[model samples]
Target: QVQLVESGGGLVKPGASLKLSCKASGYTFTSYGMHWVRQAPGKGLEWMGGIIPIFGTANYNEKVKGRFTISRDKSKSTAYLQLSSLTSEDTAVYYCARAPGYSNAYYFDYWGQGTLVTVGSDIVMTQSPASLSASLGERVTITCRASEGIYHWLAWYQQKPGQSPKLLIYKASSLASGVPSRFSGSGSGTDFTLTISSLEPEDFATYYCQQYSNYPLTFGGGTKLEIK
Candidate 1:
């Protein structure tokens, strides 16, 4: 079985720097690209960057491009993210994922468990109903609130067991491509919700909310929707 183990979570003072690691197993590490994603204490997911180990090439998000470095050691089958000039805004859980080989799309298939980093202070994202059980064809809604106003920078994702999370809503209420019309997002500022107008058999999965309007992007603890 393929696995990604992450480490390097701990406290770091403001203005300091930190290095996180992800080790890959059960697959050819250099054969696929490795990407970095992050979430603040209570905010949405953010794409930091990625590296192709075999090619020794990398790409990073403009937001962190200058201060974040993604690198890898093929011999150790491990990838690293070095963050500099860290602040309270940089406090979040960092994750590493394996990108599909030879693909142009930015999709991750396998992901690390994640490593958390705290940089003095942060925002809080609270999700309602930690878990729920619903019947098929029923309407379902999950809510998330931020400690402070986050405008419309929010996203929702669904994750089934043993699989990477799938983006369902972005920018608060915009549906991602290929998503069902039954799925929708609404609300703004510090409040947001993700709704499934009519739940399908496949809808019974874990749902999470994220906020990107502020520094140190964060995510909800998640709501587990189970079949009743």
Candidate 2:
């Protein structure tokens, strides 16, 4: 079984302009190529680019020129991303990945279960009132939970202050901008989530939650910075 679903629109302002989507079921959708990543809650993760759906073609990171845009539509297989102005630092949570089927290929096996947006301030969609006094940031909103459809083995990192942990959503979360984005992530089979919304005072540093699906890789249990 496989799953990948993402639909954007939770709120956008800043400069304004957002359109995102990613749909895939089971497997085999043109071979590979369907990536998009970004983060900015606590900081770290900024790939922002990927396409190649047999030929739809795509590529970004020119320092995030003209905002951003990545497309794909293998005839409904689904895969699209657009973020033109938007601010509030562009809110967070925007993942729609699938590229590292294996053999390395940059990483990002599969992900899609994150679609939380909220630009220009005023975003309140809190969850987690258990699982150990849960409470992440921006007053409380921690994430990074998976175990459902089994996404494409993942990998994401971030740990500021002296520098060290810095991989910004690999294989799936595929992001890595010039730095800030309050971190983010999406989901897919096996469930997935890795967000860090509104927690930037420089993001206090510390946030790593990976999942290469398997094969010697598994991270999750890092979300420090609790000065509540």
Candidate 3:
């Protein structure tokens, strides 16, 4: 089964540094880029940054300036995201994902089973976080897993309680003006992630993980929040 598994710290103290990672299996790392995404309590999905192994390029959201970074090792077929100078506002689950190989213009076509990053004092962090952030960095991450046998047809959406879902990271997390800086996107082929760096008060929208790789797009069971 083609999958993208995201593993990272579930909880962290404010004003600290954190890093997480995602490992890719059953695909070609060189053929796709990795996207990182973020979401806090009651907000929309924000794009943090992304790591393109094929070109050694990492992009980030301006809002997350000086606070997000993405890296990857094609040799190991693994990707990562690191958040530096964390804070209570930065509390959220970070995801790693695979981008389709041929369509960099659209959202992730494939995904791993969704992983959860529950932020609280009662949980435990099992793996390393991705990396720190810098201005002009791509920190948005969207992870998706292709069911049985699918191709590049995955898509992502933005939603909030009592509001119709908006298309923030569609066609690869690139929308029009007013699309929050914390919201950004990356990924093409098989591995992808949509990330929101430095979750803020206004960014209280729920994010959806969908797959456009097939005729009927599939969405992952969403991950919500418990505001602090």
Q: Indicate which candidate wins on lDDT.
A: 1
Best by TM-score: 1
Tens digit of per-residue lDDT, candidate 1, span 115-214? 9899984457888898899999999988998988878877787887655577787778888778999999999888789899999999999898866554
User: What is candidate 3's lDDT per residue for 1-228, written digit by digit as tens?
Assistant: 556777776666666666677888887777887776665545434456666788877666566756777888888788877777776666655656566544322355444443444433111111112222223332334355444433334455555565434456665445534577776666556555667775665445556655544322234545443244
What TM-score quantifies how close candidate 1 is to the native fold?
0.61
User: Over the stretch 1-228, how does candidate 2's per-residue lDDT look in tens digits?
Assistant: 657788876875677887888888788877877766655555434456677787776666565645787877787998878888777766777777676442322456555665767886111111232232323357333455544333645555655554335556664455665645766666555555566666646555556555544322234545655444
Model 2 is weakest, by summed lDDT over 10 consecutive residues, at 121-130
Alpha carbon lDDT at 190, candidate 3: 53
lDDT of each: 0.81, 0.60, 0.56
Output the TM-score of candidate 3: 0.51
Ranking of all candidate structures by their TM-score, best first: 1, 3, 2
Q: Give the TM-score of candidate 2.
A: 0.31
